[PDB]
């Protein structure tokens, strides 16, 4: 990992493998109708989530969501990213690794928001908060 497999070598497990799946559209449909915490509109209507800002590889159990807060000082950015995390956690099989990040350059505190969203320990503690989980479920539920 990290540094790629030396180009001269092929993973033996991979060779045998080479010897229906989730796509960007399906992921977009799962999150496009999440509601904004403060406004009666969807993340799609607010340009917070977009299909082209989604990356996924089913075989490698990985999905990456870039989201764009409505303003560079948005105080709801972590809650929005967390609601995306919860939606994809429920809908996708548990093998999937979900990464949720602020679109580069679109939030004054993107590094600190990304770090929180990527900390599975702190996310797990947050989702044990009955109040927070209730607010998140409110946002997620489509109408």
């Amino acid at each position: 990992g990290g540094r790629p497999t030396e180009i001269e070598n092929i993973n033996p497990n991979v060779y045998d493998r080479i010897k229906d799946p989730f796509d960007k559209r399906e992921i977009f449909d799962l999150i496009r109708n999440i509601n904004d915490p403060e406004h009666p509109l969807t993340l799609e209507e607010l340009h917070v989530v977009q299909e082209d800002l989604i990356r996924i590889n089913d075989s490698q159990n990985s999905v990456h969501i870039s989201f764009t807060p409505t303003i560079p000082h948005c105080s709801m950015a972590t809650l929005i990213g967390l609601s995306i995390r919860v939606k994809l956690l429920r809908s996708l099989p548990p093998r999937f690794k979900v990464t949720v990040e602020i679109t580069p350059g679109t939030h004054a505190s993107e590094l600190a928001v990304n770090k929180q969203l990527a900390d599975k320990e702190r996310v797990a503690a947050a989702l044990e908060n009955n109040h927070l989980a209730e607010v998140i479920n409110q946002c997620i539920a489509a109408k």
Binding site: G1, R3, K97, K115, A124
Partner: protein, 336 residues
């Protein structure tokens, strides 16, 4: 390399993610904890591991870590319910003797000192607590330490001395010790190098070196340089200074949540969010000021989800245990 990491047993028991495993000091028993708020004690009967006792109702929220006293009679459990519980067998059945409170938020980690007379905890409230252990229900707070600026992930006592190391979301590792004259606990050093969260820390046998693992996908080897050292490292505050003498990069795809340095073999094991367990060994010719650590074997699909913890058996050389978000515990044998 020519080394091999062989799977010997796969165990489940818990419902949901399993955060920690901890060997009993004698190596034929271990404990595990997880999301389901239970502690399971496993024992070896023949060639089969199974749950011997379950400790429920000790915590109202996720149990993040458990550690055995060095005498093996006490178990400490750190929980997201902002408490640490101490368990022991006096009736023949594990029971909760006491509950240590005081942290504002989730307790992330617990650690016993070498003598078993000191207990350390750390929390998302950015603090490290040190307790003196005087009885089954006798605990006095000796220090409340606030140098860290973010959530504190791990605390680990030095294997020989009453030195405490702590690793933090603020990307640093800190060292604590009693001030000689008045015995107040203070911060002795700050280890700066990692560019993201430090999840794991473990000393080598004699405690003169430390290995750390981070969200930045590297592990680092730190060496201690004491005042008057031959190497010429400056010790301005007349304190022991730790310097990063080796970084192992490009070997991990995602966050490294745990690292364990075997006191019997000197091997280093890592638990990674890319599902891989990797084993490292120091090179024969490596210099003490610029050591080289090579990966001798790996199991990149060790689990089906993130590996949360790896722990070398303290008695059985080369035996490793891991646990994972996939709800499994696995016991391995490494051969060089």
């Amino acid at each position: 390399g020519r080394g091999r990491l062989i799977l010997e047993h796969t165990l489940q028991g818990h419902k949901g993610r399993i955060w920690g495993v901890a060997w009993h000091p004698k190596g034929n028993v271990f404990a595990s904890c997880g999301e389901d708020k239970a502690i399971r004690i496993w024992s070896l009967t023949g060639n089969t591991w199974s749950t011997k006792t379950i400790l429920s109702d000790g915590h109202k929220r996720t149990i993040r870590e458990i550690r055995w006293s060095p005498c093996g009679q006490y178990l400490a459990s750190a929980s997201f319910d902002a408490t640490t519980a101490i368990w022991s067998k006096s009736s023949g059945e594990f029971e909760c003797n006491a509950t240590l409170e005081g942290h504002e938020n989730e307790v992330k980690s617990v650690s016993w000192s070498r003598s078993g007379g000191l207990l350390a905890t750390c929390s998302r409230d950015k603090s490290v607590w040190i307790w003196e252990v005087a009885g089954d229900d006798e605990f006095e707070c000796a220090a409340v330490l606030n140098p860290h600026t973010q959530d504190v992930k791990r605390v680990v006592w030095h294997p020989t001395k009453d030195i405490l190391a702590s690793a933090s979301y603020d990307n640093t590792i800190k060292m604590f010790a009693e001030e000689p004259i008045d015995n107040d606990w203070d911060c002795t050093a700050t280890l700066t190098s990692h560019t993201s969260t430090v999840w794991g820390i473990d000393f080598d046998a004699d405690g003169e070196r430390l290995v750390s693992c981070s969200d930045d996908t590297t592990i680092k080897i730190w060496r201690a340089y004491h005042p008057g050292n031959t190497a010429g490292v400056a010790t301005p505050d007349q304190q022991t200074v730790w310097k990063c003498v080796c970084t192992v990069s490009g070997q991990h795809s995602r966050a490294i949540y745990d690292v364990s340095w075997c006191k019997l073999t000197g091997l280093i094991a890592t638990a990674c969010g890319d599902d891989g367990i990797r084993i490292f060994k120091e090179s024969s010719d490596s210099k003490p000021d610029e050591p080289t650590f090579e990966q001798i074997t790996a199991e990149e699909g060790a689990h089906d989800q993130d590996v949360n913890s790896v722990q070398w058996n303290p008695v059985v050389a080369g035996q490793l245990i891991s646990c994972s978000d996939d709800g499994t515990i696995k016991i391995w044998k490494v051969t060089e």
